[PDB]
Design a protein around this ligand. Structure first.
Ligand SMILES: [K+]
Ligand SMILES: [K+]
Ligand SMILES: [Mg+2]
Ligand SMILES: [Mg+2]
Ligand SMILES: [Mg+2]
Ligand SMILES: [Mg+2]
Ligand SMILES: [Mg+2]
Ligand SMILES: [Mg+2]
Ligand SMILES: [Mg+2]
Ligand SMILES: [Mg+2]
Ligand SMILES: [Mg+2]
Ligand SMILES: [Mg+2]
Ligand SMILES: [Mg+2]
Length: 235
RNA sequence: CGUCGUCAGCUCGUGCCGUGAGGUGUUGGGUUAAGUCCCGCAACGAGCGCAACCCCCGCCGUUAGUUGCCAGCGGUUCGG
């Protein structure tokens, strides 16, 4: 909530090419063939976006964090492992929202296999199944790590790169789900309901935005939490 | 019942794409006897198949000696 001047490394966008003309309104200028985000409109949209986030959080809503860009995976896996908003980390499976019932059946199988490895039934039906179900539970935890927390459809989704996660965005549009996204110059802002015009490649931009967002979430429900332990992920 | 053919296939449910017939999944890369498995993927699963569970042949044990052996000894018309 104090990120006015601390926006160090967020204004850097993509190159001159690989952009989207619809993003031109959120661009300040072009320095050395690189689009730089308008610093004013950034906070201008941040006001409305964070206000919507606070309203949805203090009402008890659930937000789905989607990140697959390989530069926000380790960040999303813990910023959502904070206040219980679920997340999708390894890859976004087609139909997670429109076919939510089948993926929930997969989650049922996940917790079923978790119950089997908690019961003494591990030794019966010998080692063949003890390896098959082991690998099955492994990949289920690999893909449904954060998704298992969704009992129903989410009330909003959070995206790190709406161009890389365009399928999740489209599915959210189909179900009238609000779309919060950290957009860059390579994305279409019309599809995003609450835009955050920042950088999606840098680690500090993602860490800053997501850390402050989860801090706002926990602040809306009281009990301000300590600073997130995602700084050590700078590496 | 024969046949393609023990050939590796044929489909469904939901989602997604297309005005629609349909497509996706079932394509792809690695692998296998195999749609076998792995990785990737707008797909996620499932059914009939594949394989497995059945039988026979291979090694060993337990249980049991009207089949077997001077393995072990005695008798022997010396033929367990
Ligand atoms: K067309
Ligand atoms: K193949
Ligand atoms: Mg065969
Ligand atoms: Mg279909
Ligand atoms: Mg056509
Ligand atoms: Mg249609
Ligand atoms: Mg079909
Ligand atoms: Mg087909
Ligand atoms: Mg095909
Ligand atoms: Mg199969
Ligand atoms: Mg596939
Ligand atoms: Mg007899
Ligand atoms: Mg006998």
């Amino acid at each position: 909530t104090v990120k006015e001047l601390l926006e160090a490394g967020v204004h850097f966008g993509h190159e001159r090419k690989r952009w989207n003309p619809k993003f031109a309104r959120y661009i300040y200028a072009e320095r050395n063939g690189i689009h730089i985000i308008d610093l004013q409109k950034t906070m201008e949209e941040l006001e409305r976006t964070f206000r919507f986030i606070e309203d949805l959080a203090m009402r008890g809503g659930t937000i789905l964090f989607v990140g697959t860009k390989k530069q926000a995976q380790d960040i999303v896996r813990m910023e959502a492992e904070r206040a219980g908003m679920p997340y999708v980390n390894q890859r976004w499976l087609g139909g997670m929202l429109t076919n939510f019932k089948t993926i929930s059946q997969r989650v049922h199988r996940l917790e079923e296999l978790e119950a089997l490895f908690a019961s003494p039934e591990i030794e019966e039906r010998p080692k063949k199944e003890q390896v098959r179900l082991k690998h099955e539970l492994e990949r289920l935890q690999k893909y449904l790590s954060g998704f298992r927390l969704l009992k129903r459809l989410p009330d909003a989704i959070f995206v790190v790169d709406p161009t890389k996660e365009a399928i999740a965005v489209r599915e959210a549009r189909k179900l009238f789900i609000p779309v919060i996204a950290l957009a860059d110059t390579d994305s279409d802002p019309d599809l995003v309901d609450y835009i955050i015009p920042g950088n999606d490649d840098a680690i500090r931009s993602i860490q800053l935005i997501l850390s402050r967002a989860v801090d706002l979430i926990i602040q809306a429900r009281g009990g301000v939490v300590e600073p997130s332990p995602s700084y050590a992920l700078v590496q």
